[PDB]
Amino acid sequence: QQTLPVAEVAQNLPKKGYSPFGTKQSSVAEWSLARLDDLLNWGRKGSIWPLTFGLACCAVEMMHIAAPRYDMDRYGVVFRASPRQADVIIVAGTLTNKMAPALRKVYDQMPEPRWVISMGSCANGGGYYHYSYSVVRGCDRIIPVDIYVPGCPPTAEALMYGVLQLQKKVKRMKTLQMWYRK
């Protein structure tokens, strides 16, 4: 790892700023595309709409970020039932062999950009039914997954930590800078 910086060292460090790219771009067109990508990523991270895809027990914790203690609504996060209106699909439960074409069709009808959160050990790696005859060995064999939330029923702080990690990934998305360098 790295040691987290001591406050004597960290007082000499300057402020990071909001932009992961920095304001030190050379060209004015590159700087304008950087700020446009910053505004676009702020709009995308300011409201991600996850889809009501609750397969198994993990989803009982998924409603617990809907719950008044954790309150996902002040993070841009609000559930949508239709897959067209939703940004994120949260695979929260056990993907089985009869569940595989349904999950693939629901993911394919979702419009791009598409970030996928694997909630729980049945969602990533198979988990407690990994050696079962009718359980897919994780959802990574079917749906491409950006965030993997570890706990068997993830606490709801850990699922919301996965949500904040997805927001940091969305804030780190480089589209217009790649277009300028394509």
Partner 1 sequence: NMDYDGSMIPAEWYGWMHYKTDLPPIRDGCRPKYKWIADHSENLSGTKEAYYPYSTTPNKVEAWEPKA
Partner 2 sequence: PRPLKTTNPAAMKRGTGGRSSFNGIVATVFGATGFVGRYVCNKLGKSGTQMILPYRGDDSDVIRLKVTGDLGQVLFHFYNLEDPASIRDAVKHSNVVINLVGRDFETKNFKFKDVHVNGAERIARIAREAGVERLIHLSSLNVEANPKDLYVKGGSEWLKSKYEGELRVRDAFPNATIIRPADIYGSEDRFLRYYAHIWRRQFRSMPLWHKGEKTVKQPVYVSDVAQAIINAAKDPDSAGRIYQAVGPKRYQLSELVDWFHRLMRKDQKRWGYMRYDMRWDPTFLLKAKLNSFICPGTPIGGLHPARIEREAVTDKVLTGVPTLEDLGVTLTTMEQQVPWELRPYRAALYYDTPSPPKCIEARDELRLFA
Q: What is the dihedral of CA 129, 56, 103, 80, to 10 degrees?
A: -160
What does 145 bind: ligand SF4, partner 2, partner 1, none (CB cut-off 5 to 8 Å by kind)?
partner 2
Q: Which span (30-38, 47-55, 130-138, 163-171) binds ligand CDL, by CB under 6 A?
A: 30-38
Angle CA(160)–CA(166)–CA(171) in degrees, nearest 5? 130
Considering beta carbons, is residue 40 or 57 the nearer one to ligand SF4? 57
What is the distance of C-alpha 80 from the center of its chain?
16
What part of residues 9-38 is at the interface with partner 1 (CB under 8 A)?
15-18
**Least gap, CB of 102 to partner 1 (angstroms):** 29
Asked if residue 29 binds ligand CDL (CB under 6 A), the reply is no
Q: Which three-class secondary structure string do you get for 34-93? A: HHHHHHHHHHHHHCCCEECCECCCHHHHHHHHHCCCCCHHHHCCCCECCCCCCCEEEEEC
What does 137 bind: partner 1, ligand CDL, ligand SF4, none (CB cut-off 5 to 8 Å by kind)?
none
Q: How far apart are CA 132 and CA 140, in angstroms?
A: 17
What part of residues 121-150 is at the interface with partner 2 (CB under 8 A)?
140-146
152 marked among binding-site residues: yes
Asked if residue 108 binds partner 1 (CB under 8 A), the reply is no
At 139, give phi and psi (nearest 5°): -85, 0
Q: Which of 4, 10, 13, 28 binds partner 1 (CB under 8 A)?
A: 4
Q: CB under 8 Å to 135, separation ≥6 — which residues?
A: 94, 95, 96, 97, 122, 126, 129
Q: Site residues (CB under 6 A) for ligand SF4?
A: 56-58, 93-94, 120-122, 127-128, 152-153
Q: Site residues (CB under 8 A) for partner 1?
A: 1-4, 15-18, 157, 161, 164-165, 168-169, 172
